Amino acid sequence: NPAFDMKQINALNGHYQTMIDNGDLQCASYMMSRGGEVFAAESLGEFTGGQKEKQTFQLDTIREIGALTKVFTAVAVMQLVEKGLLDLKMPVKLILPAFDKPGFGEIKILHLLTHTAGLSFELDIQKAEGIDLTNEEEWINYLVSTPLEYGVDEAWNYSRTGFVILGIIISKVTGVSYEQYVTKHIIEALGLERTYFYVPDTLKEEVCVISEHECVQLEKSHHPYFPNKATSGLYSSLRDIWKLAEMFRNKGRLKDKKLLGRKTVEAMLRNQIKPGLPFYFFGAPREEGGFGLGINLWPAGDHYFMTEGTFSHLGMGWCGMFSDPAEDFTYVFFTPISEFHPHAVLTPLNIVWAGIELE
Numbered sequence: 001n002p003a004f005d006m007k008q009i010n011a012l013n014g015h016y017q018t019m020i021d022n023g024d025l026q027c028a029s030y031m032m033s034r035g036g037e038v039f040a041a042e043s044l045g046e047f048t049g050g051q052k053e054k055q056t057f058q059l060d061t062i063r064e065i066g067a068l069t070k071v072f073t074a075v076a077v078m079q080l081v082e083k084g085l086l087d088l089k090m091p092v093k094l095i096l097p098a099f100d101k102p103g104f105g106e107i108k109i110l111h112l113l114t115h116t117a118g119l120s121f122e123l124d125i126q127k128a129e130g131i132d133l134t135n136e137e138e139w140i141n142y143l144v145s146t147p148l149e150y151g152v153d154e155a156w157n158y159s160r161t162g163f164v165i166l167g168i169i170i171s172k173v174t175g176v177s178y179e180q181y182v183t184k185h186i187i188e189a190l191g192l193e194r195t196y197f198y199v200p201d202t203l204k205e206e207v208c209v210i211s212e213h214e215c216v217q218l219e220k221s222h223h224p225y226f227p228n229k230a231t232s233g234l235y236s237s238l239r240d241i242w243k244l245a246e247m248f249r250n251k252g253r254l255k256d257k258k259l260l261g262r263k264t265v266e267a268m269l270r271n272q273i274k275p276g277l278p279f280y281f282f283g284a285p286r287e288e289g290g291f292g293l294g295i296n297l298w299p300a301g302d303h304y305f306m307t308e309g310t311f312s313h314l315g316m317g318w319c320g321m322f323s324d325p326a327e328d329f330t331y332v333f334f335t336p337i338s339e340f341h342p343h344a345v346l347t348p349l350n351i352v353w354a355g356i357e358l359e
C-alpha cells in the first residue's frame with residue numbers, strides 16, 4: 001500500500017539501535033507516512049534526566065521541539081496576513097515604535113520570517129544588567145540599543161531573535177499573548193492533542209528529559225530570557241509534528257481542520273531569498289539553499305535523496321520534520337541528544353528516502 005521497501009525500516013531501526021547501544025543516543029523515535037497514512041513508526045531506547053532511572057521512550061512521549069516552534073510562529077504570522085491585520089512588507093517600526101531608528105527602521109516582517117533582517121543569532125543576557133529579559137517593554141528597548149550585524153537583505157543569518165520579535169508582533173495585533181493565539185488558532189484548531197507551551201502537571205512525568213536543565217525548565221512558567229516562546233519552548237509529540245507537516249503538504253488543510261489557504265502555503269513553500277546572498281549559521285557560513293516564509297527548503301535535490309521541493313525544519317533536541325510533496329511522503333523524528341552529530345540526525349534521511357518506491 002505505501003510502496004516502501006521495508007528492508008530500509010530494518011536498516012533504519014538498526015541504525016538508531018546501534019547508536020543507543022554505543023552510548024551516543026539515549027532514545028530515538030520516528031514516524032513516516034505515504035498519502036497521509038502512517039505505515040511505519042517506532043520508538044527505541046529509554047531516557048533519564050540524570051536524576052532518576054530509565055523509563056521507556058514511546059511514540060506519544062512529549063518532548064521539547066526547540067526551533068520547530070518557529071514553524072508555529074510562521075503559521076500564526078501568515079494567518080494574520082490572511083485576515084488583513086498584517087502585511088509582509090510592513091516595517092516593524094509601524095507595529096513596534098522602538099524600531100523607528102537608523103538600521104531598525106528598515107526591517108520588515110518579511111525579513112524576520114526569512115532570516116534576512118540582519119539580526120545577530122541571539123541577544124546578550126550578560127550585558128543586560130538590571131534588565132528583565134522576560135519583560136517585553138524592556139527586551140525590545142535593550143534590543144534596539146544593540147547594533148545590527150548586517151543590513152537588511154544582505155545575508156541569510158539564522159536568528160533566534162527574529163522570531164521573538166514576530167511573537168511580539170502577533171501579541172500586539174491580536175490583543176492576546178503569543179501563546180494564547182497559537183494555542184487557540186493553531187494547536188486546538190489543527191487538533192494537536194499532546195502539544196503545550198507549558199505541560200500540565202499530570203503530564204510532566206510523561207515528558208522525556210535528558211538533563212537536569214530540562215527538568216528545571218519543565219517546571220518553569222516563562223522562558224528564562226525571552227518575553228515569549230515564539231522562537232523555542234514548545235513541547236509536542238511525533239503525531240502532532242506529523243500533523244503540522246501534513247498540513248503543509250496538503251496546503252493548509254488536514255481533513256476538516258483548515259489553518260491556511262492553499263495560496264498562502266504555496267507562498268510559504270517557495271524560495272524567498274535573493275540569489276547570491278551568503279548564508280550564515282551561528283557565525284559559520286553554510287551552503288546556500290532555498291528558504292521560504294519561515295520554512296526551510298534545504299536540504300533537497302543535489303546529492304541528497306529528497307526530491308526538489310522537499311520542505312523541512314530542524315530543532316535542537318534533536319528533532320525534525322521532512323515532507324516530500326512529489327512523493328506524498330512525510331518523515332518526523334525525535335532523537336534526543338545534547339551534542340550534534342550529522343550521522344545521528346542527518347544520515348537516517350538517506351536510509352528513509354532510499355526505501356521510497358514508485359506510486
Ligand SMILES: C[C@@H]1CCC/C=C/C=C\[C@H](O)C[C@@H](O)C/C=C/C=C/[C@@H](OC(=O)CCC(=O)O)C/C=C\C=C\C(=O)O1
Pocket residue numbers: 065066067158160231232233281282313314315316317339340
Ligand atoms: C542545517 C541547519 C541545522 C544544522 C545544525 C548544525 C550545527 C553544526 C555544528 C554545531 O556546532 C553543533 C550544534 O550544537 C550547534 C547548533 C546550533 C543551533 C541551534 C538552534 O537554534 C534554536 O533556535 C534551537 C531552539 C532550542 O534549542 O530550544 C538551531 C536549530 C535548528 C537549526 C535548523 C537549521 O537551520 O538547519
